[PDB]
Amino acid sequence: KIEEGKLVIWINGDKGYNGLAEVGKKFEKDTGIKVTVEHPDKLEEKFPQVAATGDGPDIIFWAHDRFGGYAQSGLLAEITPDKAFQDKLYPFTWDAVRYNGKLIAYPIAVEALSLIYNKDLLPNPPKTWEEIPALDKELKAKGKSALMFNLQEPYFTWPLIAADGGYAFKYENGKYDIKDVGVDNAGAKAGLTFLVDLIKNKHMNADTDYSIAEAAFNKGETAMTINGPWAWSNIDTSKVNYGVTVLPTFKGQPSKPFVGVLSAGINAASPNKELAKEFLENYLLTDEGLEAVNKDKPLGAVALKSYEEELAKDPRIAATMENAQKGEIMPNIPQMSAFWYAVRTAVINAASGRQTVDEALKDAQTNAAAPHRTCREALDVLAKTVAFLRNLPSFCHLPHDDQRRLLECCWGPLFLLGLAQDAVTFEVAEAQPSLAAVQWLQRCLESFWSLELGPKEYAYLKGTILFNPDVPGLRASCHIAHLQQEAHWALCEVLEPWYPASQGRLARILLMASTLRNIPGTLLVDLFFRPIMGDVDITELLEDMLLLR
């Protein structure tokens, strides 16, 4: 349960975990305390998962922007660095780790996204984004690209989005306005609109991720790329003469990259708080310490004044700083999680074409500024759905095995059809279901709200969905089939007064109902119930309300 006498450390996979491991070996040889450095995936969300239960690592490394939330949740311990030690680090990096007036982590280094270009290919990197498309046009003539960076993380595309006017939370009087979100204003829209047009014009792929971008650049397939200090290490070992410089300017204005401060926090549930402090203060946060780490993968501008002055001569670090000035420090408030997820969803939906720029930034702006009013409405619909089945003798008189069987694969469509008729727009704020699925869910749902069905149509349709003869191992299969046919005949008579239009309505409603049946029951739980009642077994819960279990 977080073992005593040992020290487990978690750090992102793109950092110099090997260099850190070495500092751990030196630490282990001196104190006799084992130190294991792990780098799990989705660490950003995996830490809080276990941290709450009481387990997890003793020390956690990540940008300050997340620590604020972990603090509120009570997953971190307030560090106790004596005055003397504080003076060794820049007072500028101490604010990044200060939440509600308490230091919640040790500052390690300041990182900022910069433009990395291949000198041999581009002796002169572009000054503006606008001039990139044309630059890609000819580079292609030689089987090469112009720009290639990760599009799966809004962190990389933010500089462009905020360039014109986009921003997370308005800042005034040393305070953040959790209600003022600028992710769907004129500025943000233009920026993301440019990014999309780059994909549409085949100047960039939508599925491009971190790995793809890195490989493509280190192999000389792309002329430029956007990354942080940690990425300079792998480029060196590759035959590429790169150069780190200021990011392109969009619409005359500079790109404002979010500045982050790599920080180390101590788990509030660890019995090695002292062993931790000792390690982060007398080993890692030292000239030799940060050098070992930096040696593996660059840390940018280290918080340790002494070691910072040595690397200050590095032209690459200077570029990172130039870019950092143009940008702004990341907020560390609890809502930052909701923000990032909302933005991540918008950028990916727009790049993949599942949504338009306006549609994407529309939902993000609403989700970024998060009520579980959605879930509470799903619960009402579910209960409603139970009352609907308790009535309707046709279903109550069916064999119990059939009742449980029809329920096992119909509660989904039945429930969704309930949300529709109950007129409840949803705000999926999941601060892991696939975006494609979620997007498909709402499209179908909005399809019902625009078709404007009546009370009869809904009722007869529900019958068509409930009594499904195709359900494997069904006893009263023939009778159920006769029941579905009746509902289908009724659904038609309610649409019979026609001359022209009602004809395309039956096919429309029908196909729409079919898309409902193709929605993962698992997805429904994670989107409407889990967030309010933890893990849940709908089939089980429903058989209880209907006394079938």
């Binding site: 009535n391 309707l392 003798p393 309930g418 009869k456 009722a459 029941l483 509902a487 009724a490």
Partner: peptide
């Protein structure tokens, strides 16, 4: 086994 229509309309009233 018939007139399931009238039944459905009545049973789904809870959603009005």
């Amino acid at each position: 086994m018939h007139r399931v229509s009238a039944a459905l309309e009545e049973a789904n009233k809870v959603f009005l």
